[PDB]
Design a protein around this motif. Structure first.
Motif, PDB file in Angstrom:
ATOM      1  N   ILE A  93       0.832  -1.200   0.000  1.00  0.00           N
ATOM      2  CA  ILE A  93       0.000   0.000   0.000  1.00  0.00           C
ATOM      3  C   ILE A  93       0.868   1.252   0.000  1.00  0.00           C
ATOM      4  N   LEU A  94       1.953   1.236   0.777  1.00  0.00           N
ATOM      5  CA  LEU A  94       2.845   2.388   0.839  1.00  0.00           C
ATOM      6  C   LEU A  94       3.528   2.633  -0.500  1.00  0.00           C
ATOM      7  N   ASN A  95       3.941   1.564  -1.184  1.00  0.00           N
ATOM      8  CA  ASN A  95       4.547   1.719  -2.504  1.00  0.00           C
ATOM      9  C   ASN A  95       3.552   2.290  -3.505  1.00  0.00           C
ATOM     10  N   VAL A  96       2.305   1.814  -3.467  1.00  0.00           N
ATOM     11  CA  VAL A  96       1.285   2.347  -4.368  1.00  0.00           C
ATOM     12  C   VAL A  96       1.045   3.826  -4.086  1.00  0.00           C
ATOM     13  N   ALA A  97       0.957   4.193  -2.805  1.00  0.00           N
ATOM     14  CA  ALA A  97       0.763   5.592  -2.441  1.00  0.00           C
ATOM     15  C   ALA A  97       1.947   6.447  -2.874  1.00  0.00           C
ATOM     16  N   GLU A  98       3.164   5.916  -2.745  1.00  0.00           N
ATOM     17  CA  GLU A  98       4.351   6.640  -3.188  1.00  0.00           C
ATOM     18  C   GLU A  98       4.322   6.872  -4.693  1.00  0.00           C
ATOM     19  N   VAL A  99       3.917   5.857  -5.459  1.00  0.00           N
ATOM     20  CA  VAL A  99       3.811   6.015  -6.908  1.00  0.00           C
ATOM     21  C   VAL A  99       2.774   7.075  -7.254  1.00  0.00           C
ATOM     22  N   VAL A 100       1.622   7.045  -6.576  1.00  0.00           N
ATOM     23  CA  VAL A 100       0.576   8.032  -6.846  1.00  0.00           C
ATOM     24  C   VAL A 100       1.062   9.438  -6.511  1.00  0.00           C
ATOM     25  N   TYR A 101       1.748   9.592  -5.376  1.00  0.00           N
ATOM     26  CA  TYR A 101       2.262  10.902  -4.985  1.00  0.00           C
ATOM     27  C   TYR A 101       3.294  11.406  -5.987  1.00  0.00           C
ATOM     28  N   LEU A 102       4.173  10.520  -6.459  1.00  0.00           N
ATOM     29  CA  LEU A 102       5.170  10.924  -7.445  1.00  0.00           C
ATOM     30  C   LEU A 102       4.514  11.329  -8.760  1.00  0.00           C
ATOM     31  N   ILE A 103       3.466  10.610  -9.169  1.00  0.00           N
ATOM     32  CA  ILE A 103       2.738  10.984 -10.380  1.00  0.00           C
ATOM     33  C   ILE A 103       2.091  12.353 -10.211  1.00  0.00           C
ATOM     34  N   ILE A 104       1.484  12.601  -9.047  1.00  0.00           N
ATOM     35  CA  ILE A 104       0.882  13.908  -8.783  1.00  0.00           C
ATOM     36  C   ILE A 104       1.945  15.000  -8.819  1.00  0.00           C
ATOM     37  N   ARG A 105       3.134  14.707  -8.289  1.00  0.00           N
ATOM     38  CA  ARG A 105       4.246  15.649  -8.383  1.00  0.00           C
ATOM     39  C   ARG A 105       4.610  15.922  -9.836  1.00  0.00           C
ATOM     40  N   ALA A 106       4.587  14.883 -10.676  1.00  0.00           N
ATOM     41  CA  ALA A 106       4.888  15.067 -12.092  1.00  0.00           C
ATOM     42  C   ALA A 106       3.872  15.987 -12.759  1.00  0.00           C
ATOM     43  N   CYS A 107       2.597  15.844 -12.410  1.00  0.00           N
ATOM     44  CA  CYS A 107       1.553  16.702 -12.959  1.00  0.00           C
ATOM     45  C   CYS A 107       1.389  17.969 -12.127  1.00  0.00           C
TER      46      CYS A 107
END
Lengths: 47, 47
Positions: B33-47
Protein backbone atom coordinates in the motif's frame (compact mmCIF):
# COMPACT_ATOMS: atom_id res chain seq x y z
CA UNK A 1 -9.71 -47.65 16.25
CA UNK A 2 -7.19 -46.62 17.46
CA UNK A 3 -5.33 -47.21 14.18
CA UNK A 4 -5.11 -43.87 12.32
CA UNK A 5 -6.54 -43.83 8.77
CA UNK A 6 -5.81 -47.24 7.15
CA UNK A 7 -2.75 -49.35 8.01
CA UNK A 8 -1.26 -52.44 6.38
CA UNK A 9 -0.96 -55.62 8.43
CA UNK A 10 0.78 -58.84 7.43
CA UNK A 11 -0.56 -62.35 8.02
CA UNK A 12 1.71 -65.20 9.10
CA UNK A 13 1.96 -68.16 6.69
CA UNK A 14 -0.99 -67.32 4.38
CA UNK A 15 -0.11 -70.02 1.84
CA UNK A 16 0.29 -72.91 4.30
CA UNK A 17 -2.90 -71.82 6.08
CA UNK A 18 -4.69 -71.74 2.72
CA UNK A 19 -3.49 -75.27 1.90
CA UNK A 20 -4.63 -76.64 5.26
CA UNK A 21 -7.94 -74.77 4.93
CA UNK A 22 -8.49 -76.40 1.54
CA UNK A 23 -7.73 -79.82 3.04
CA UNK A 24 -10.17 -79.29 5.92
CA UNK A 25 -12.93 -77.92 3.68
CA UNK A 26 -12.60 -80.82 1.25
CA UNK A 27 -12.72 -83.31 4.12
CA UNK A 28 -15.78 -81.58 5.60
CA UNK A 29 -17.57 -81.62 2.25
CA UNK A 30 -16.78 -85.32 1.84
CA UNK A 31 -18.19 -85.89 5.34
CA UNK A 32 -21.38 -84.00 4.44
CA UNK A 33 -21.86 -86.02 1.24
CA UNK A 34 -21.17 -89.26 3.11
CA UNK A 35 -23.72 -88.39 5.81
CA UNK A 36 -26.34 -87.59 3.16
CA UNK A 37 -25.62 -90.88 1.39
CA UNK A 38 -25.85 -92.74 4.71
CA UNK A 39 -29.24 -91.16 5.41
CA UNK A 40 -30.48 -92.09 1.93
CA UNK A 41 -29.23 -95.68 2.32
CA UNK A 42 -30.90 -96.00 5.72
CA UNK A 43 -34.17 -94.67 4.29
CA UNK A 44 -33.95 -97.20 1.44
CA UNK A 45 -33.37 -99.90 4.06
CA UNK A 46 -36.51 -98.71 5.86
CA UNK A 47 -38.52 -99.05 2.63
CA UNK B 1 5.26 -42.59 -1.67
CA UNK B 2 6.62 -44.57 0.10
CA UNK B 3 4.14 -43.83 2.90
CA UNK B 4 1.47 -46.57 2.88
CA UNK B 5 -2.16 -45.39 2.56
CA UNK B 6 -2.49 -42.07 4.48
CA UNK B 7 -0.42 -41.21 7.56
CA UNK B 8 -0.70 -38.41 10.10
CA UNK B 9 2.21 -36.01 10.52
CA UNK B 10 2.60 -33.31 13.15
CA UNK B 11 3.90 -29.79 12.53
CA UNK B 12 6.24 -28.06 14.97
CA UNK B 13 4.92 -24.84 16.57
CA UNK B 14 1.89 -24.23 14.30
CA UNK B 15 0.51 -21.41 16.46
CA UNK B 16 3.74 -19.40 16.77
CA UNK B 17 4.39 -19.87 13.05
CA UNK B 18 0.85 -18.66 12.33
CA UNK B 19 1.39 -15.55 14.48
CA UNK B 20 4.68 -14.70 12.76
CA UNK B 21 3.11 -15.38 9.35
CA UNK B 22 0.31 -12.94 10.18
CA UNK B 23 2.88 -10.33 11.23
CA UNK B 24 4.88 -10.75 8.02
CA UNK B 25 1.80 -10.71 5.78
CA UNK B 26 0.46 -7.56 7.44
CA UNK B 27 3.84 -5.86 7.07
CA UNK B 28 4.05 -6.90 3.40
CA UNK B 29 0.56 -5.57 2.71
CA UNK B 30 1.44 -2.28 4.39
CA UNK B 31 4.56 -2.12 2.21
CA UNK B 32 2.48 -2.73 -0.93
CA UNK B 33 0.00 0.00 0.00
CA UNK B 34 2.85 2.39 0.84
CA UNK B 35 4.55 1.72 -2.50
CA UNK B 36 1.29 2.35 -4.37
CA UNK B 37 0.76 5.59 -2.44
CA UNK B 38 4.35 6.64 -3.19
CA UNK B 39 3.81 6.01 -6.91
CA UNK B 40 0.58 8.03 -6.85
CA UNK B 41 2.26 10.90 -4.99
CA UNK B 42 5.17 10.92 -7.45
CA UNK B 43 2.74 10.98 -10.38
CA UNK B 44 0.88 13.91 -8.78
CA UNK B 45 4.25 15.65 -8.39
CA UNK B 46 4.89 15.07 -12.09
CA UNK B 47 1.55 16.70 -12.96
Amino acid sequence: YPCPNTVDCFVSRPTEKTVFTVFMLAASGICIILNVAEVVYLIIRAC
